[model samples]
Target: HHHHHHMKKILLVGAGDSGKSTIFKQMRLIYNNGFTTEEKTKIKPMIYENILRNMMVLIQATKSLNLPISTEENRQRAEKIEGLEQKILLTTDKVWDSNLAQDIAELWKEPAILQAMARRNEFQIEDSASYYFDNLDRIGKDDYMPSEEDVVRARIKTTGLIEQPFTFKNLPFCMIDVGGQRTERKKWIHHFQGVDSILFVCSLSEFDQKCYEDDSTNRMKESLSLFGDYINSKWFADTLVYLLLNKHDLFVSKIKNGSRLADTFEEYKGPENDPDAAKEFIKDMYKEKDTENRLRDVFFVTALDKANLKERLEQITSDILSAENDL
Candidate 1:
């Protein structure tokens, strides 16, 4: 088979747990490659465990400071928070295991988990503080300490070089999987420079479940808004942006019997033959309700489910790559 060889680069950026990795998984499946079940499982625990450890560290640090708040109350709060985190951690672990098993069973394929791990490792290096620290060493003998600019610049360079190379339908490609932590947002600005396209992943299920009812939601909203603003800020003004309304299976199951607006998908064909038009329709629905203009090119997807995945992925790939010819 003759294969086309037009190399392209893409960056996946969004709030953590917004289905970024899940989307990557789907992309791998479409390309006939990506992270393995064991590798995914291994990497999955790091996120949750890191969050838990961070929480404990915060609790302990706060208590040691002898603040106005009662240590006993703080301790109790920490315990309660840890308990909730543990429950979520356990539930998600089980779900991930089951989901992976199902994917293997139905697809009759074992994904390239090691490739996913390598991609993830590349992201960590690019997004890590060590990247900045090394750059600081390179710019030696500066009396003035390395500022945020220096750090961000180094991160951007790192992101630009980190690679997850793959081929889909004979098209050679690479991806930059940006870390979604709040601190990593500034670094994305660097990565966005010269990028051809971006994929923004959002979890409808997470929003519907009020997962951000706490302070964490504020950070998420801020990060997302900032990302949008960044794209609009001339650096990526013409870059094609596609939003994935991921975890759609969960959304369908949860909202189909509920009052969420996405449930309307059942009755509406949504401006046939035009995905952008359908996206605008959805955006208008949210706008009429005075919600934010955050929903952009929102396509429903269940990354773990193989049923509609290939079709959805093809739709997205076509929309993105077609931009080059259209422009």
Candidate 2:
């Protein structure tokens, strides 16, 4: 746990709605336990507003996509979102006292909203849209400091290559979400070149989810292709690449519910609907494509309170921090 000058600039890259941002928030919590009061003060209002924002998105996306909502009152509320948002949300220390809190939570389960969420992959999602809307009461407390799960589910409606630094077992490191859009890559070289490692993020559950720009259900296809390109990049010659397999909670669930890897990824012809074997098949996929052997690791993680994910996370960081010492 001794401090060192070895700084890892981890480029957290992935497709939209993937768990890159969720992992970004989680790094803070896992490293320091949680954000400080000052940090919470800034995040508090954003969490408050994000609940309404998530509902608003599902509502409009439902309407625009010609999907349906549960109630006319909900539909009416969607239209007046701007004003209602102004009323219920305050950016200061105040928690929402409005009685509309319960109404907002229920809207998440509405047929229209639920359907829209099912189609969230057809476009870009700032974060998983279903995250915090179901937890209004827990979030709207006056003395609320976001729990680890709350921070994971708390959606922030903003973007940039934010530099996040933390000490793991007392080793110095910095990770940045190198904005997951095309234009943002132009600014990528400024931070990533000559880095020791890159925790390349990808959603394991997105095998059936399409990208924003295409009709393919392998939403991670482009992300992996791009990682292949990075693997081939001379600038990253000595860098150790890690495929951060995120959303494995959903991955396990989708598999448990009858989703099969071989269905989408034809090469995954192993045991059908098996999460454990499926992950190894995926690891083989990475290893086969890593012609240069640049990818040295794969870390599976879940942002929500998924049982058994903690063991995986603990082992990965132990390996990462241990590996960092060799540098």
Question: Cα lDDT of all candidates, in order?
Answer: 0.45, 0.65
Candidate 2 local lDDT, 1-327, one digit each (tens): 743355666666665566667766766665564666687777766676766666666666786788766678877656666456666645544435455466676666678878887766444444545556655667655566776566567655336556667656776667666543444444543433346666777777777665643355466566667667766774665566677788777888878777667777887777876899988777677666678777767777775543444465456556767775584
lDDT (Cα, tens digit) per residue for candidate 1, span 116-222: 22222112222222232233233223232333233222212122323456655666556666442334333432333356667766655442233232333333234
Which residue runs of candidate 2 sit more than 4 Å off their true CA positions? 1-17, 64-71, 82-100, 115-128, 140-145, 155-194, 213-218, 260-263, 303-327
RMSD of each: 16.6, 6.1
Q: lDDT winner among the candidates?
A: 2
Worst 10 residues of 2 by lDDT: 185-194
Local distance difference test, candidate 1: 0.45
List the candidate 1 regions with Cα displacement exceeding 4 Å.
Answer: 1-6, 32-163, 180-193, 211-231, 259-282, 285-298
* Prediction 2 global C-alpha lDDT: 0.65
TM-score of each: 0.46, 0.70
